[PDB]
């Protein structure tokens, strides 16, 4: 069949430009003579319709987005790609490339939507630290384990225990805002007691808008 | 200036028959063809009928729609209500060459009991304090229901000056989950002998404590 | 009081809304009293009309 | 009250707890089968719309 991609950095500052491009696999853009649109949702929010466009360069925007969107085609990549131009806080929305069937028809197929945040002020990438179990920390025969992500900006920010290995017990909490602008969270991992000086831990915290890819060892606390 | 006037909130119990609305404003709604998407939480929106009458290879048959163009609404039929169908509903239009969407529907679940409020904390770590910061860690798991107040002390002292604290969450098992989070000056943890935080959860109280080793 | 109303010609409560009978009706119809099995004490009300 | 047999008078109260006759079968005094409730129960939540 024919499958969408969507590319491009899942972040933009305000009154800047955007660029996110769709890619086409397994089929061809200028055959069949069908169109492409994109098609944007804010969370929690109805689905908003951006504009369309075709392969040639017919193209057609919302009113209420006239005069900010820019799309083209090029078919020697075999893809397009939306410009966005004076960019606000409010344009917070998870973008869904879907592939049009008709006009005034159906998106018969819906590319996965890729998150967009748009916040003021500079990129602050996070700051992990490990969380030691110790006595204290178990109640029972098992015991818990995580690491604290804190002073980042701005959301999201995913954590992974050994690589996405261990799933069972992992809480990956909402972040909260803090005193000072930046956000806060933690991911944890419950574990039985018996594996806490056997088994090594180490949580995967990964913030694609500051591209910092932090890897910290979890270990049991030690006394000086 | 057209809009598709979709009720916000719909709720159903499984087996029944319900039905959603599309009001449109200006324009009637037997112009151009609606589309209804059904919209999973976190995935892309899939297609569940086409030309207000006919079912795409792959919905089921209970995915039916009416247009009742007199009143210039919008019907989509639901028969037989079941736990996969809790997704969000957008009818869609074309309006002159501007496509416009639907406000968006929700189908509620209409359960869990109360769950022991296990509570874990956590020291600051070592690599911490040399960057000059500390933070004290609450962790509040596996509890029903979904409101625990949490209250920082300090030897015997309160504490709320930096207490930050997240809003419970609905668990993979159906229970809650909740964290706070403790801002502090290195020179504040070991001023004090040793910090404790308590959670209150229905009356009952577990605390933990921690101090500087 | 209803087995006289088995026949054809007639309008009725049971034969024309259960059963109806066509004039082309060559059936033969038997009909007994077996009261002391299909009836009980207290009301026996399984079946329905 | 979701069920009733018949219209009712203006400024009238009705308390009746009685099984509608809602297929009129004898279901041993309870909703099953051709039996159903009048009186049923809300969907109050304060986080609706």
């Known amino acids: 069949q024919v499958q969408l991609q969507e590319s491009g950095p899942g972040l933009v500052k305000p009154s800047e430009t955007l660029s996110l491009t769709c890619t086409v696999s397994g089929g061809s853009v200028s055959s069949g003579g069908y169109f492409w649109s994109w098609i944007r949702q804010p969370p929690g929010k109805g689905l908003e319709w951006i504009g369309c466009?075709?392969?040639?360069?017919?193209?057609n925007y919302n009113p209420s987005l006239k005069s900010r969107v820019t799309i083209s085609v090029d078919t020697s990549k075999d893809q397009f790609s939306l410009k966005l131009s004076s960019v606000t806080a409010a344009d917070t929305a998870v973008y869904y490339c879907?592939?049009?069937?008709?006009?005034?028809?159906?998106?018969?197929?819906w590319g996965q939507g890729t998150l967009v945040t748009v916040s003021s002020a500079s990129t602050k990438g996070p700051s992990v630290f490990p969380l030691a179990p110790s006595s204290k920390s178990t109640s029972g025969g098992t015991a818990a384990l995580g690491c604290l992500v804190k002073d980042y900006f701005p959301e999201p920010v995913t954590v992974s225990w050994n690589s996405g290995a261990l799933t069972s017990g992992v809480h990956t909490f909402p972040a909260v805002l803090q005193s000072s602008g930046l956000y806060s969270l933690s991911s944890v991992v419950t574990v039985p007691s018996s594996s806490l000086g056997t088994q090594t831990y180490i949580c995967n915290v990964n913030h694609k808008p500051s591209n910092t890819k932090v890897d910290k060892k979890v270990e049991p606390k030690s006394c000086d | 200036n057209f809009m598709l006037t979709q009720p916000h909130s719909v709720s159903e119990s499984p087996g029944k028959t319900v039905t959603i609305s599309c009001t449109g404003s200006?324009?009637?709604?037997?112009?151009?063809?609606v589309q209804w998407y059904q919209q999973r939480p976190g995935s892309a929106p899939t297609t569940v009928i086409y030309e207000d009458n006919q079912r795409p290879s792959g919905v089921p048959d209970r995915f039916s729609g009416s247009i009742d163009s007199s009143s210039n609404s919008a019907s989509l039929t639901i028969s037989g209500l079941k736990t996969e169908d809790e997704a969000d509903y957008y009818c869609?239009?074309?309006?002159?060459?501007?496509?416009?969407f639907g406000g968006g529907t929700k189908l509620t679940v209409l359960g869990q009991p109360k769950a022991a409020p296990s509570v874990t904390l956590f020291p600051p770590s070592s690599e911490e304090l040399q960057a000059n910061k500390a933070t004290l860690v609450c962790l509040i798991s596996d509890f029903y229901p979904g409101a625990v107040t949490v209250a920082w002390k300090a030897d015997s002292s309160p504490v709320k000056a930096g207490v930050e604290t997240t809003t419970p969450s609905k668990q993979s098992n159906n229970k809650y989950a909740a964290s706070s989070y403790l801002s502090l000056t290195p020179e504040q943890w070991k001023s004090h002998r040793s910090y404790s935080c308590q959670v209150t959860h229905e009356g009952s109280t577990v605390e933990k404590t921690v101090a500087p080793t | 009081d209803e087995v006289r109303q088995i026949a054809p010609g007639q309008t009725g409560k049971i034969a024309d809304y259960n059963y109806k009978l066509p004039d082309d009706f060559t059936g033969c119809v038997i009909a007994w009293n077996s009261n002391n099995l299909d009836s009980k004490v207290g009301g026996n009300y399984n079946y329905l009309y | 009250r979701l069920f009733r047999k018949s219209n009712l008078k203006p400024f009238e109260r009705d308390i009746s707890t009685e099984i509608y006759q809602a297929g009129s079968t004898p279901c041993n005094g309870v909703e099953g089968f051709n039996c159903y409730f009048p009186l049923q129960s809300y969907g109050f939540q304060p986080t609706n719309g």
């Open positions: 879907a592939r049009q069937l008709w006009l005034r028809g159906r998106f018969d197929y």
């Open positions: 466009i075709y392969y040639s360069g017919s193209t």
């Open positions: 200006s324009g009637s709604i037997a112009s151009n063809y």
């Open positions: 869609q239009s074309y309006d002159s060459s501007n496509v416009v």
